[PDB]
Curated annotation (Swiss-Prot):
Residues of the full protein shown: 243 to 335 of 716
Subcellular location as annotated: Cytoplasm
Originating organism: Homo sapiens
Summary of the function given for this chain in its UniProt record: Involved in the signal transduction pathway mediated by multiple Wnt genes.
Modified-residue entries (Asymmetric dimethylarginine), positions: R29
Family: Belongs to the DSH family.
Protein name, entry field: Segment polarity protein dishevelled homolog DVL-3
Modification sites for Symmetric dimethylarginine: R29
Length: 92
């Protein structure tokens, strides 16, 4: 019984996509998780992140109080723009 928080910086120069899908909503009163990891993606290459892991922060953006649409939109814009990508996730 512990909380494991890992920071993973992805090789975005080699892989042009995260290859992940996010599920859930942190929007409602009272989180956002990795639904699935796609092969050929940066997240699959790193191997540390697994499905059911809670997504806390990407780069300088925090996913708290975010709807699924908004959360997907943040990720689209970050992947679209050139640069490195760093995820903070809480292991299930
Ligand atoms: C959640 C998310 C959002 C954006 C992402 N990057 S991306 O903007 O460059 C992106 C966006 C969209 C796709 C493919 N399109 C869809 O997956 C897609 N397009 N419309 C959809 C509706 C429901 C579920 C999926 C989709 C790809 Cl292959 C890559 C990524 C990613 O790079 O893994 C993940």
């Amino acid at each position: 019984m512990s909380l494991n928080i890992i920071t993973v910086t992805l090789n975005m120069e080699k892989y042009n996509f995260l290859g992940i899908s996010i599920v859930g909503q942190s929007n409602e009163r009272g989180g956002i998780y990795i639904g699935s990891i796609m092969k050929g993606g940066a997240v699959a290459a790193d191997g540390r992140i697994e499905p059911g892991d809670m997504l806390l922060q990407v780069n300088e953006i925090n996913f708290e109080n975010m709807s699924n649409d908004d959360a997907v939109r943040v990720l689209r814009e970050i992947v679209h723009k050139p640069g490195p990508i760093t995820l903070t996730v809480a292991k299930s």
